[PDB]
Each structure stands twice: as C-alpha cells, then as structure tokens.
Design a protein around this ligand. Structure first.
Ligand SMILES: OC[C@H]1O[C@H](OC[C@H]2O[C@H](O[C@]3(CO)O[C@H](CO)[C@@H](O)[C@@H]3O)[C@H](O)[C@@H](O)[C@@H]2O)[C@H](O)[C@@H](O)[C@H]1O
Length: 364
C-alpha cells in the first residue's frame, strides 16, 4: 500500500522525508507519499487541531499503549485542545511528538560583546528592556522583527501572556466575566514596546529575519524554539541561546509558554490503519524522537524529557518546576485573524483598535 502523509511543518521537511525513507527500507509492503483524508498526519497543537479533533477527522488514540510512556502534561495539553464543552469529549486524538517553547533566541557572541552573561539572560521585564537599550547604545540592532509573516507576531504575545494571563481567564472571557481590554492590554502594550527596539526594517519575512540573525546582525529574534533549525542551517557556527521573555518585574513568578509543537495522528477513516499505525510506532520510538529533537532543537514527549539543543539550558528550570503555560492563541478561534490584527497593532501602536477588533470578533 501507499500512505498519504500530510506533514505540516516546513522547518522539518527534510527530517520526515528521511524518516519515511528509512521506514520504507524495513517495510517493503508500505510506501509513503509525503504532502480523501491523509493516512498519517502531523499538525501543530493549536485551536485548529482541536476543532478537527472534535469533528472526528482524527483517530481516537485515548487507550493506545504508546500513551503511558509519554509526558502526561503534553498528553493533557492535546486532550484539552479538543473544542467541545463536554468534559467527557476531551479525548486524545493524536500523539505528542515534539514540544516547543516561546520566548527569544539570542546571540551569545553579541551578549559577550556587551558584557552580558550568555548563561543568565534577563529575569525581569526592566532587565530585558535594559538589555535591548544596551545593545542599541553599543551600535547593535537589538531585535529582528519578521512582520511580513503575520504568524510570527503571535510569538511575543504568547510569550508575554504566558506570565501575565492565567489560562483560566479564557473561560472567564467566554462567559463574559472578563474582557480583552482587561487581560490583553498589558501583553500588547509590551509587545509594541519590544518592537520599538527593532532598529531595522520590521516588515521582512520569517526567512529573511532568520537569515539576518544567523549572519550576526541582531542581538535577539523573538521567536520560539521551532525557529532554531532555520537559523543554524544558514550559519552552523552561530552560538545561540534560548530564553524566557520576562513579562513583569516579579522574577519569582515568571512562566514559560510551551506547547505541543507537533502532534502525530492518523485519519479516522484511513483504509490503511494497520500500516499507518506501523509507521506511527516507528516515529514514536525513543531513538527517532531524540533524533528528531536533535535535528530540530525540540523537546521530546517522553516522561524522561530530552532537550535537543544545549541552547535550551536557560529554560530547563521552567520545565523542571512545571512553571509552563500553553499558548494564549490556542483559545482564539481560527476564524479570528489574530495575526493580521497583531501586525497592525505593532506597526501602528493602536492598542484600542486591536482590543476592540479582538473583542468584537470574539463576541460574535
Ligand atoms: O507563536 C507562533 C505560533 O507558535 C506555535 O506554533 C509553532 C509553529 O508555527 C509555525 O507554523 C505555522 C507557520 O505558518 O504557523 C501555524 C501555527 O501557528 C502552523 O499551522 C504553521 O505551520 C512554524 O513554522 C512551525 O514550525 C511551528 O511549529 C503555536 O502553536 C501557534 O499557536 C503560534 O502561537
């Protein structure tokens, strides 16, 4: 048989191509075509995933023997993404394959240039902003923006909201006991502040920005762990770090936004379920998982967490202490153009217009 493998992740295209070919060598009865439900699917762990899960597009993995070896936190993330109001319908419709974190990637060599300690990034908002001013004052571009790709603007919001806005607030928001004005004003104000320290053309693509950063022209790029491989492929010698973006001056209560970066699933109505499951068990072996995590600087979904790049060391404490949070935008319906509104808020500085757009679309 031939399996249709829908693979969402641009940054990992080569890894999955090679994994599939390796699987084919050992399984001559199975061919894998990488892109009528596809048989095997990778999807980002977000609202869209949850909506397709609730509609029955995906196989129900809840009882699968593979689950017991997985990080329970990541499994529950996947289950809670299901877009349903019935607690009982929060079933597992995919397997966590890799985790991420949102914050910022920084150039350790530029840290050293201005006397900052590359192993101890800023712990508070004031210290974070002083760091950017310090880079500017020293003649270094502090922040590489990538606004032409709207989704990238969601990262600093998600990072910041991770600490400022408890996930419980989204239930209060739906029931109308709170508002975007009340919960997202401070995150968006600070995201605007952040990008005032982008001293180069802000309106460039994700690829352009990752190229710029790799070539040493910016101190930080405020994206999550998923961007690391895009950077290292442009310059293998870049000395990179990854850090939590501190949203307040309460150093003791900082939280790291972190989610299921890749969920691996199967089409509920595949005609080749046995073969599909065989490929999925191959991808979910520890060996493959850690190999993937090394290639993509990701976090494995096994109970004994493996970090794929030493750049992630500064955020290890957040994971160990369970001081993490899922992305704010996982509570925002896909029909709401959050990306577009955010890119307008960042460029224009018009907070009122951003909040009202979010609130009115939500209310509807
Ligand atoms: O903060 C941005 C984003 O982070 C998380 O998703 C990471 C995901 O983002 C990018 O994938 C695309 C690129 O268009 O963005 C959507 C998800 O927002 C994906 O469907 C799409 O492939 C990266 O290119 C991926 O490598 C990466 O996995 C978070 O889950 C998102 O909600 C959002 O906040």
């Amino acid at each position: 048989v031939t399996l249709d493998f829908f693979q969402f992740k641009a940054e990992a295209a080569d890894w999955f191509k090679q994994a599939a070919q390796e699987f084919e060598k050992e399984n001559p009865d199975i061919r894998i075509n990488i892109n009528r439900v596809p048989d095997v699917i990778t999807f980002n762990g977000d609202y869209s995933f949850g909506t397709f899960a609730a509609s029955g597009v995906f196989h129900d993995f809840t009882d699968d023997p593979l689950v017991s070896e997985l990080n329970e936190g990541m499994v529950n993330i996947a289950k809670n993404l299901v877009q349903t109001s019935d607690p009982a319908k929060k079933r597992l419709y995919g397997l966590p394959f890799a985790g991420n974190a949102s914050g910022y990637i920084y150039n350790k060599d530029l840290f050293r240039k201005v006397g900052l300690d590359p192993d101890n990034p800023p712990q508070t908002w004031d210290e974070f902003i002083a760091m950017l001013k310090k880079f500017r004052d020293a003649g270094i571009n502090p922040v590489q923006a990538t606004l032409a790709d709207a989704w990238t603007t969601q990262a600093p919001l998600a990072s910041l909201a991770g600490t400022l806005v408890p996930e419980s607030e989204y239930a209060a928001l739906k029931s109308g006991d709170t508002t975007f004005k009340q919960i997202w004003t401070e995150p968006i104000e600070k995201e605007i502040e952040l990008f005032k320290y982008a001293d180069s053309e802000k309106g460039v693509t994700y690829q352009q920005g990752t190229q710029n950063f790799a070539k040493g022209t910016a101190a930080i790029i405020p994206l999550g762990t998923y961007a690391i491989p895009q950077i290292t492929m442009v310059n293998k010698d870049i000395d990179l770090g990854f850090a939590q973006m501190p949203a307040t001056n309460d150093a003791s209560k900082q939280i790291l936004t972190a989610g299921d970066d890749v969920i691996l699933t199967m089409g509920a109505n595949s005609r080749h379920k046995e073969q599909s499951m065989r490929f999925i068990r191959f991808l979910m072996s520890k060996k493959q998982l850690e190999n993937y995590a090394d290639a993509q600087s990701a976090i494995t979904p096994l109970k004994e967490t493996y970090f794929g790049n030493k750049a992630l060391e500064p955020v290890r404490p957040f994971f160990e202490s369970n001081r993490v949070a899922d992305f704010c935008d996982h509570y925002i319906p896909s029909s709401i153009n959050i990306g577009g509104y955010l890119q307008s808020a960042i460029m224009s500085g018009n907070v009122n217009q951003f909040i009202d757009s979010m609130q009115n679309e939500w209310n509807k």
